């Protein structure tokens, strides 16, 4: 008795094949008789319609580019007191002793983060990195520090 009253007042039969629009348009080769209706809709919608940007592609350059090729060379200047502070902080982070809280690979890490953060590593940083990696027996990491210095 509760099912006999609730009929289909919600759905409708689907579109047949080669059907037309409710406005009269159709998918033919000649589209001069068909019109667009985007200018009749409201200009701005609060939210997102189910047909809003449903098929939107981007350029081929975005998926054919290599890594780190979009970064432009920016000259980030700063105060010389900030230069002294950051150089002393990087020199203190490189020279950390290898205990149970610091692995020797961090001596290679804090040099690399020095170049990612757009600082020029001075010679004392390379000296400290090579001596800290030599004191821990990491000779290949010291040669990696030398190759980092050569590639700069």
């Amino acid at each position: 008795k509760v099912d006999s009253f609730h009929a289909n007042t919600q759905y409708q039969h689907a579109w047949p094949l080669l059907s037309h629009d409710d406005l009269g348009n159709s998918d033919q080769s000649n589209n001069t008789k068909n019109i667009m209706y985007s200018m009749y809709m409201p200009k701005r919608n609060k939210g997102t319609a189910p047909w809003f940007r449903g098929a939107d592609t981007y350029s081929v350059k975005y998926c054919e580019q290599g890594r780190y090729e979009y970064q432009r060379y920016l000259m980030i200047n700063r105060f010389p007191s900030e230069y002294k502070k950051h150089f002393l902080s990087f020199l203190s982070n490189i020279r950390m002793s290898s205990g149970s809280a610091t692995i020797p690979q961090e001596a290679l890490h804090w040099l690399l983060r020095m170049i990612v953060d757009n600082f020029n590593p001075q010679h004392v940083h390379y000296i400290a990195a090579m001596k800290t990696l030599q004191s821990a027996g990491e000779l290949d990491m010291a040669r990696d520090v030398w190759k980092i210095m050569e590639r700069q």
Partner: peptide, 27 residues
């Protein structure tokens, strides 16, 4: 007001919906 936003496309003379309306109001 009482008219919708699709009114000028629905009642445009020469269109399918306008010709259907003219055939409905005058058979």
């Amino acid at each position: 007001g009482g008219v919708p936003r699709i009114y000028y496309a629905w009642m445009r003379p020469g269109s399918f919906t306008r010709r259907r309306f003219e055939k409905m109001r005058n058979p």
